[PDB]
Design a protein around this ligand. Sequence first.
Ligand code: ZN
Ligand code: ZN
Length: 383
Amino acid sequence: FEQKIESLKKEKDDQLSEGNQKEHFRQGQAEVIAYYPLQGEKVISSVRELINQDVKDKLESKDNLVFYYTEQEESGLKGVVNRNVTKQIYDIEETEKTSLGKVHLTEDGQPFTLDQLFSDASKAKEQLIKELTSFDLSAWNFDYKDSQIILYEIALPVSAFFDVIQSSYLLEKDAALYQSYFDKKHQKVVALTFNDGPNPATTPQVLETLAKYDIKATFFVLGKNVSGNEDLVKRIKSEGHVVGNHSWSHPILSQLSLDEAKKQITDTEDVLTKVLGSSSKLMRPPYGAITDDIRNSLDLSFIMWDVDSLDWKSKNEASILTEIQHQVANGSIVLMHDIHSPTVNALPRVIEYLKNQGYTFVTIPEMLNTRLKAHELYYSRDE
Ligand SMILES: [Zn+2]
Ligand SMILES: [Zn+2]
């Protein structure tokens, strides 16, 4: 027997002596041998700590011989390596656990934690919990592989967090994915959108101006305004613009019962399909007021905005232009109302400014294209 124990100890030294320092002790009835890894000539402190924690809490006082040791592996992130910890218990019966635990490390042996992966730890945790539920941050157990963050498991595409990722930690494949994401994010597109029409006294001039400047827009029209304006609605579509649904009569939809709010929307789908032959399946709630139940009841995408021109409030062409100059960003969806003269009058200067800054004007379907799904809310190209 004694010779058998000696052979186990000799085998482990033959396997593990190099690059490790060997600790030996008894705890209770257990004999323990731990191989702590060196980085250069120094014990990796956070690995020694993880082993010692297991010794305190989980090591049972049985007549056994217990070994701990580690192996270095790649982490899947640039400049980060992992130590996997194996625990083996001999009673000759034996049982081992590989990756009993794992620590992530800089190449020089210092702790790397999940929060360091992100430029914004607070937002990332928020994004992680969100994607997590759909399926301290530093203390989160994780792995990284095949372009996914693995939570302890739960595997989440890394692409979902590119908004808050520290991209310098990405290896080649992920860095090319991030580059593509960044280039798309910096594509200079804007969607002009107009609520509350058609209005026979102003919409025709808006159409003439959009045609002059060789751009398209998206018009969220009221069902009640379609009667008597059918040829105007057809003209909006004939000139290449997109027509969406702005309810029948402009109530606060979230303050109606579910079926009355749904019917405000489907009555408007009905009249638009009758006049145009088709629906874009885009719906913008009056006042931005909507509920989850209404959204989940209808096969439509709900289009909000991120830039309010304030045309409705300022009623002033110079103010409208200033708001556009200061607020418009890549991917913005701009709210205007094609029902009063300040907006009509301001439009040429707004378009000239944005084209002079290098923007492309897009329709909502052009902007959202792949992203558009039933029930969902959209505030901009990306949000
Ligand atoms: Zn085994
Ligand atoms: Zn409106």
